[PDB]
Design a binder for this molecule. Structure first.
Ligand SMILES: Cc1cc2nc3c(=O)[nH]c(=O)nc-3n(C[C@@H](O)[C@H](O)[C@H](O)COP(=O)(O)OP(=O)(O)OC[C@@H]3O[C@@H](n4cnc5c(N)ncnc54)[C@H](O)[C@H]3O)c2cc1C
Ligand SMILES: Cc1cc2nc3c(=O)[nH]c(=O)nc-3n(C[C@@H](O)[C@H](O)[C@H](O)COP(=O)(O)OP(=O)(O)OC[C@@H]3O[C@@H](n4cnc5c(N)ncnc54)[C@H](O)[C@H]3O)c2cc1C
Lengths: 478, 477
């Protein structure tokens, strides 16, 4: 079935809105111990866990589909990943779900250097290009990232030995309070233009924000989780994806919860308020429908929380977090291109372009190279507003080398049920707000990847929180 | 309470058998069944936990007087001595998931602590001399040796084994599973110094628990790939972080969750001898003769113990081959509470002349003394219970004239009829040939064990991976 989310473009058709996805459900309602608000991976995991354990559970979702910030669209036999894509066995919670659902052998490597141009193209201004082996690329980045992360002599292993517990070493704090910008000023004189351009594009790829509004320490956190090495990051952040797309993975959570016969659900159901009552909680949609359950697991994203009325009011720490917002404003654009040899191309174009990092990520059934392109708040584009400028930004990644057959993207920034992409914090925000984002609220359990402990902001972190949310509810009732 | 497993030695008390463990279940029973789970190790504990929480009436039948199997801890004078499986990391999916779900992510200790004391690595290649080194220099030497050992494909195994969960993804990988440790060393011999080769062999033998000749090179590549294809990755995953309250506190979490569903039946001290599949049901018979019936059976008995069990209908050709050959890990693990405070920051390799080859300062008891953990392998084997003097000699040769022993603690895994080996490690070619047969349906018997996991095979993680698969399979109803 075809979702309301997403955009597609071809030369023949122009820009159309709405694309297919297995995430679309399916019949939109089939209508409690528990209400779960939101059906991304956090909500899916909580719901799966709770229904399997014997609770009647109602899932309320604003969209016409499951998956939230992660979901895929099969177009002409090719899964286009609209948001969260990549997974790895070094990621505990997603991996456990992958193997339990027997999908550990249903993955593809995004990188294929076995034919074609097999180079990295670095663009530091609009006129000119630098070419490089992928090896040389790997090494440009290791060298840059070593300097960026070596605040303690051990690339973070001393100040953050236990990433799950940021205050184990009291001293990590100053790094959470530091911006990318402040860090770079410290190591500046020691970086070439090539190292710095590569480094800035890489760290901003990770934050989706700006040099000034991105927490250095949050990046140290990603680095630490990944093995405190550049190759560790690439393995964990960008190497392996589902062959059948993230939506086939979300479906497995959905099918299991449904198979218990304890699942109620409503889609197209944007929640407007959550009010604690005597021994229960009442959730009301924008259109006035009301639902009641003993406990509510609320998985609305940080950047959307300020749209909801809660009673009692949320705590002071929750309020600051949501008013400030996280900074990831990532624009992600897929491009089906007519250059077959670009399967093995990668490119960084920084800082002049609105898309700054792109990779050949696959080959469609039609035989065309698929490129994925990323842009950040550093030089922002809204990919839907002016196709001409979006195309010009894709092309500038490799001027004069290809024509575009198709674009596919979803706009996360302008999307009212996301308002941003994956979580990334401002300097000081996690230090300050994480405990609060995570604290009790009577009968409401706030659970989201945005405030995970481990792979925070990742599909993994959604699953971690989701599991934690089910466990809390279980303990409180039973 | 005190288990019958394990041993303790002090100058004052001699050698005593039996040591405390929170893993001991008292009382030893609380008794139709949907599922019988044979074995209360991490694999049995996971499958039972999952099955009972999901609503199944489950009977757990365990040979020992305790849970944990090849992993369990003993609190002696307020210190947890890890008798088997010890270390965990967040790059191990299954164990970590259980740790965070049980909220024990913040209940870990670092084994390594280089912040005071002798702070050096001691390498011994003959009984009369030592070579002293910094920890940095130690890391460097092993990083260099291991780079040469693993660089079969130009990228330290990343090309031939990109998805360790699927070993045959690259068909070229098989030839390496069929190689032995010694086959690979001989290929690079002329490029390794004594110090590089001594360190290398000690490290790779530490991982296999067997000999140069019977350890699969490919299987070491599998551990290497799971850890991140680096030496630091291996250290992080293999030996860095342990539970501050001991592995047995961790297993008790699976137990209490299972117990509190009210759907758990159990019999400790109950060794099984036979499992026969009947019509839509299956019958399990103890040694004493007790019979149990359930619709399906999850059997978590270790590979090396399986041939003691009698199955009907009979197991397949590849299962039989696997259980006759047996895995090679004959690891000896001996704890020494010693009187040298400065050895907190010590590590040593003594190879190949000593019966314990690898050892580390691993903590400090509440009494104030250094805890050393020592390993030996089938390359130069000691049976630590058979003669205390010989065991003290082995310990003392890791660093002669530097300490007196106040206490030893250990369990003999090799002479344990319910393990008959330590963690799984394969012979050349065994995993290629046998894995799938070890994984395969068997009527109403589902065989599950760390020994035949896909990812962290032979690890606690692998037990949990397998226990999880086993609970899922059972439905199926
Ligand atoms: C472009 C992009 C790229 C990414 N890259 C990766 C990657 O490579 N790997 C990775 O692991 N992660 C990646 N991420 C991270 C991302 O996948 C998230 O961290 C994760 O999916 C969040 O899941 P969640 O369940 O915590 O929240 P979400 O997925 O946002 O789900 C919660 C949402 O609650 C619903 N909701 C919101 N408001 C309301 C309301 N008012 N009423 C009812 N329901 C409401 C949303 O519609 C429902 O889907 C990426 C994300 C994006 C956007
Ligand atoms: C010395 C040592 C050090 C190790 N180091 C580490 C480490 O640092 N980190 C790590 O992750 N792993 C380590 N390992 C790996 C190890 O802990 C195992 O891989 C894992 O614990 C096996 O779990 P399992 O539940 O699959 O099997 P087990 O725990 O072996 O299986 C459960 C067992 O089945 C029972 N049983 C056997 N026969 C019968 C019978 N006839 N009837 C009834 N019950 C029977 C056993 O008594 C019961 O406990 C180590 C192991 C050892 C021995």
């Amino acid at each position: 079935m075809t979702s309301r989310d997403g955009y597609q473009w071809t030369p023949e058709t122009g820009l159309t809105q709405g694309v297919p996805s297995l995430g679309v459900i399916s019949p939109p309602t089939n209508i409690w111990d528990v209400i779960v608000i939101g059906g991304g991976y956090c909500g899916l995991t909580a719901t799966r866990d709770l229904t399997v354990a014997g609770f009647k559970t109602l899932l309320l979702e604003a969209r016409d589909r499951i998956g939230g910030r992660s979901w895929s669209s099969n177009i002409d036999g090719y899964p286009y990943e609209m948001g969260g894509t990549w997974v790895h066995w070094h990621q505990s919670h997603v991996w456990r779900e992958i193997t339990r659902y027997k999908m550990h052998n249903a993955l593809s490597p995004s990188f294929n250097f076995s034919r074609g141009v097999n180079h990295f193209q670095l663009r530091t201004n609009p006129t000119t290009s630098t070419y490089m082996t992928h090896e040389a690329e790997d090494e440009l980045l290791r060298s840059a990232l070593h300097k960026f992360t070596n605040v303690d002599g051990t690339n973070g292993r001393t100040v953050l030995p236990f990433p799950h517990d940021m205050f184990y070493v009291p001293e990590f704090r100053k790094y959470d309070e530091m911006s990318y910008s402040e860090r770079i000023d410290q190591i500046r004189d020691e970086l070439s233009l090539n190292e710095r351009s590569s480094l800035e594009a890489f760290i901003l790829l990770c934050s989706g924000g700006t040099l000034e509004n991105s927490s250095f320490g949050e990046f140290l956190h990603w680095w630490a989780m990944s093995g405190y090495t550049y190759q560790g990051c690439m393995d964990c952040l960008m190497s392996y994806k589902f062959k059948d797309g993230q939506s086939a993975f979300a479906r497995r959570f959905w099918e299991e919860a449904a198979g218990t016969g304890r699942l109620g659900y409503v889609f197209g159901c944007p929640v407007r308020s959550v009010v604690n009552e005597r021994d229960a909680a009442r959730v009301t949609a924008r259109d006035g429908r009301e639902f009641v359950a003993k406990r509510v697991v609320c998985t609305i994203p940080l950047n959307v929380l300020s749209t909801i009325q809660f009673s009692p009011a949320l705590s002071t720490e929750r309020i600051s977090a949501m008013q400030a917002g996280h900074v990831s404003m990532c624009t992600k654009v897929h491009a089906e291109v007519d250059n077959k040899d670009m399967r093995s191309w990668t490119g960084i174009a920084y800082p002049f372009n609105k898309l700054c990092y792109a990779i050949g990520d696959g080959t469609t059934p039609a035989g065309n190279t698929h490129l994925v392109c990323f842009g950040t708040d550093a030089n922002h584009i809204q990919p839907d507003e002016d196709v001409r400028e979006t195309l010009k930004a894709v092309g500038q990644l490799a001027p004069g080398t290809f024509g575009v057959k198709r674009l596919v993207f979803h706009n996360w920034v302008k999307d009212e049920f996301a308002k941003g992409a994956w979580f990334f914090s401002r300097p000081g925000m996690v230090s300050e707000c994480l405990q609060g984002l995570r604290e009790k609220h009577g009968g409401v359990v706030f659970a989201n990847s945005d405030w995970a402990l481990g792979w925070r902001s990742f599909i993994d972190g959604a699953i971690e929180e989701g599991t934690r949310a089910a466990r809390v509810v279980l303990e409180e009732l039973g």
